[model samples]
Target: PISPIETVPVKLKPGMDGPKVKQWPLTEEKIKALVEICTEMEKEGKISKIGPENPYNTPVFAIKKKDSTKWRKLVDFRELNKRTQDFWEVQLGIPHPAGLKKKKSVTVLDVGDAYFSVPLDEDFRKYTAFTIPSINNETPGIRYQYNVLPQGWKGSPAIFQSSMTKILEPFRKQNPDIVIYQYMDDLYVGSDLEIGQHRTKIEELRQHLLRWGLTTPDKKHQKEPPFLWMGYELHPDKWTVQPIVLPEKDSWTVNDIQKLVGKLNWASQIYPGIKVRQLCKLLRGTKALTEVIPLTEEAELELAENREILKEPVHGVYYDPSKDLIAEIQKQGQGQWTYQIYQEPFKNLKTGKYARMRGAHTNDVKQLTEAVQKITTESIVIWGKTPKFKLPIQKETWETWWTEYWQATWIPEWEFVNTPPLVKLWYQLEKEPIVGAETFYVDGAANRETKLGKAGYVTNRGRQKVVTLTDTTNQKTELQAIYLALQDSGLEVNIVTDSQYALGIIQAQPDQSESELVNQIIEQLIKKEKVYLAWVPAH
Candidate 1:
């Protein structure tokens, strides 16, 4: 017998709209099943009958269990969530499976109706109400709501997750060797060497769960060598986090493209080595949420091929030829426009031609206006191309682009230096040391409530200074430090930093941000001036 726990009441912000109710059409068989479930639930005190009148109401639906294929009742609480303010606890981070290579034996524990096990506050019960159709045409319908925490409630998972962690703390301490990874109802416990050791540990946990008045369905408790958690399959001997490859589609709607990119991003961790920039490029060119841009047949065919490319590994050595075909909109008439295309060339690669990359090309007028109008909903697709074989591809994100570039390039080579020891020792300048070399260090701190950034600088002669800045971003802080060093000294100096991202921007001219900070640094470094930038390993 599980005890019900009441949820803290949800408070709505001022002037918020009340809940909107929806009617769910049910099949005859489904309705009968729900009626039976309602009866048992009422007897067990999980639910109770309600009066016809209630301020808030939501529709009820049924979904099947994947393993059992049995229908489970559900309620849609999204409407209530929209009208009320809800606080979410920071999710507990799960350690990567790569760290579990040594674990020998494991046991998994499952909680039945995990969210519903938590009781709902009686004062807010009516907010979860749903209508029950009358048994006969002449009879009137009845209203009912949950007395326990309801499924599909926006805050239910976090509330239950917090409670579960608290409940399992004592058991966790008692069995220090048994590592546990909990995600809502699922709990995975394991020991590196002994099956017997964790066998008793799981029983200890089971007893504790029983003490809390929760049921551990006999069929649900089991030892594990083969199991699936969080959509990733886990077997004792064979474990590889693989992405759920979606079937290649002949056609993709605007919605399909969005979903495809989203899935690819979610599983990006598993494919750490793949560099499909052209695939990513497609996403950047997409328009705003409200903007209607039809997918071109040419673009659609390219994405289909792009999806296949992502499934494979990136290999082979290809050098940058330094040539790219560029195209942009040109105003040909007073109110009309056409593409102005040009080919810029450098040394050819192994193929003796340039790498053809197609990306977003919009003029300042339309591009800036729409950019400010709404947030970007799509990624601009920029993929590699060849002269006779032009195809669609995706460009990588700023972070991913840098990662790909760093792996492909950034090979350190030994440079022979032939200079006198006296020249390296300094004292060769005539003006004050104020216009000489300086070093700056930047770092950031982040927590729940506050984020802070600090910059420290010391001159060639060791005169030091420090400053506090807005907590925008760590990269921004690093750039700010570089900007300050350039402006304050107004001299040819060495900028040393531990930020690989900052160093990458200076070395590779990626089509990324040209922020105010970036632009200022570029402007200061005139063709006639000299500025040295170096990367140092962090301690």
Candidate 2:
């Protein structure tokens, strides 16, 4: 049977009372399902009948599985999780599949009901107590505590991972040549040998698991096509670790966001340099749980680009960078340093292949420089010129050096003091209305005495609305004016607003409740087809 490697008691906050019990009214069918589950659990020595003497009892609920009549029982341990300190140790990260050489034989194994097979310590079992409605005269307030480690518990994942590591140690020692990668319950056994030797290794491992009462479902025993270990689509044909398709943006919930982030983090182990940190920051800012914020324009665009990059396969493996090549550093007198590559190029330590030095155009040398400086105090600076270490320029830089050049130059004072004849002529042409359009003038004023505000709008069609708002500032009043005007009419409208703050709020569509008016206006702008927000100077 599976068991926790360590039996450390959970530490709760000082003087903390146990979590309040969550009760759910059960349906007739659900009641029957619960009773059956309890009976089966007791028979297997996984759960036991308990009294109400314990102060802790987590709520239990049943979720119906797709295309199945059986109900999956789950416990709501969020309250318990709040009281318990998180002490989960990070699990072993996934290896880059591109780094792994093509092997003749590979076998992937999944431990059936892995978590249920692991036993929990007697002292910690009370914390996992769950309550169900009493049926007939069996008992009053029938409570059951787990003998095996329960799912949804605070540290269950870490416990299971460590436990499996312990169980596999003996088998791993016996087969030294076989490469084993374990992530929770999934086990990947691979070797650089023929199919016959691969089958022999798999048979030995299967027998070893059987001795410990762990069974792998027949359908899950994959031998030919490599299967998913974490989230990457592990293809052995070209040996590529491709990113899994993320869920549709519209249906993403807080849990989905967290899951996607977790999957990307696993992918980061093999595919380095993903902008995961920025995406995580966006998630935090938008409050992924209660509030749904579509990815910002920049973030959404980057996500699309990253997905394309992920789709491209990483081939040509190289390993042992220390023995592969050496860098020759030359100081250029100025605040610049050049790394000239000579002889054999540096090799990627993960893949046993030659590594090429990326020039300024194709590579983000600035980011690489920052990363290097963190490891050492050396003031390593990267220049715009290409590296001459037997590497040719692969691609042009995506960004231009125009900004730096512009910063180095200066404009004459007279140019800024007076507008040129060409600029004045251009302004005259810009003022002309395009083909056909409607315009509206908007203004708002805040009352000092009542802390109220008033906003007015005038359209070319002689439609006008003067609105009075309570407990509002001038900017919100301006936003409300625009919102009401758009809602009132369905024509292509140009809003001329003197309030820059209100204009910015509407354009950005920030995820804040206080800016709900602005967000509504932006949504209307999207649906209305054509609308322009033009800023007019205010005295």
Candidate 3:
């Protein structure tokens, strides 16, 4: 039976406010000796282990937000390693270089936030106490407080992220070609070496970090390659430079099975060929995937304190071309004088192509932008293209402003037609300033297929109608008939078919490349949004 009494979970907030001795919880002599030993071990590029009994406290790290230097207490994780067995705990060296074959030079920038164990502020403590009036009455006038800090406290990640962001912000501005990603504690920044910009970016990062008050001690060399950026190493480029993430040595346990499965499943959805079946075999016997994959203590903590992972592909293949088009347009205008409209034309300063003229409408700008993106994509054969300037896509903070604007005006609302809801709903489309070599929607099935093959759609309503079409294969005949129905309404369609030989014969052409009937059908399908042809797989 459940307890009828109202109750609350006991909590604790850890802080440096305790008495001097309790604050550090280590003797001065011990601290000095441990530091000396750790320093020596660090000098040798080895993990410091002062035997099992002599465990030193994990040193605290701090950063002065004004300048962005990490005021690190020179604490090494190795001492804590003896108490735990995290794979990352053992490999404390910098990441290795990724070798790429193409000189298409690339850079990846990753920034992240980390969790801190610290105390809560006064207001939170009081509010927490106030929430339990019954318990407060029983111990009248007695105050309650927690000793440990909250997990992923909203303020903590921001404090750490801001510290790093401020340090890298100026560097990012200077090395415009370099990329920057923000995950909480993990920062991944890289680019192609032909420009030799990685060194400048890193130098700026190190210098700015020092300025910010966060300092990595002499034990850690700044120039080491393949060092952990976030948790992955930057491999040397044999061709087009891309970041390659090495596998984490953290062992999979019962508790980790579901997480692993979830990740594997998600990967399979976006990109196929992960070891799903093999892992499923391991988790097969148990009804509960969680039970089968029970988490170890370390696993629990890893998940509990884990920050989001920004997994980019290993090579330039991960790049998108659409972003490049967005970037080129953003470079045309400077400052906030220009309003965000879908379509506008500017002289392509890089290519010397004037995109639009004065008085060009919004759709013209949008179509021109898309056209430029397509042309560039076709020219470069690269799918990934980031805008030049990355203005914030979401302005949730301006909620009140928008609310007042919408409420104040009686705006004419128009029904959106023939577009995905995802495409219709937008917050802000600021002029982006940076360019990445990849498309934002490379994973989108429609976008990817549209690049390689024709997309076929089939639908009939009102003027759109087709009874049936007979076929020897018969399975696709239904789709063929539906395609006929869509042709009446006139719609553009892309259809992928594995039955190429049969389709060629039915379309009455000697070869797949010379299928006149197929081309005609495609022409008809391109006419109406209501009519389309999509040759789908039977399975």
Please tell me which predicted candidate would have the highest TM-score against the true structure. Answer: 2
Off by over 4 Å in 3: 1-153, 192-197, 217-316, 320-539
lDDT of 3: 0.32
Worst 10 residues of 2 by lDDT: 420-429
Each model's lDDT? 0.52, 0.57, 0.32
Instruction: Score every model by TM-score.
Output: 0.49, 0.50, 0.27
Clashing pairs in 2: 317-352, 317-353, 318-351, 318-352, 318-353, 319-351, 319-352, 341-389, 361-397
Going through the candidates in the order shown, the clash numbers are: 28, 9, 117
Per-residue lDDT tens digits for candidate 1, residues 1-539, read 44734366755635675465855667667677678788888888788887857756787776778977877677778887676566676465554332243356777777877766777766767677786554433255557887776777666777677778888888878767677777767777767656676677778787888887666657645445666545455665434343467655555555666666667555443333222344545556666543334445555555556566556532111122343433322222222222222233321111111112223221222321222122111101111332221111111222233353333322111122222110110011112222345544433222323546666566555655666765556666666676667676545565667777666654543332347666565545442144566667765
lDDT tens per residue, model 3, 22-44: 01234344444444543543343
For candidate 2, the lDDT comes to 0.57
Order of the predicted models by lDDT, top scorer first: 2, 1, 3
> How many pairs of residues collide in model 3?
117
lDDT of 2 by residue, 1-539 (tens): 44334554656655565576855657657767887888888887778898868778888887788868578688898887777666766554445442354455666787757667777767767777777764432445568888776777776677766777777899889777888777666787777667788788888887877776667758534444655534434544433355467555765556666777777665554454444555665666554475665676676766676687667555333222233232333222212233322224432222111122322211122322322232122111211112222111111221222122212321111111121111110001112333366677887887756869998889887889898888988777877777876776565666778888754543332222334565576556555645666777886
Candidate 3 Cα deviation (angstroms), residue 66: 33
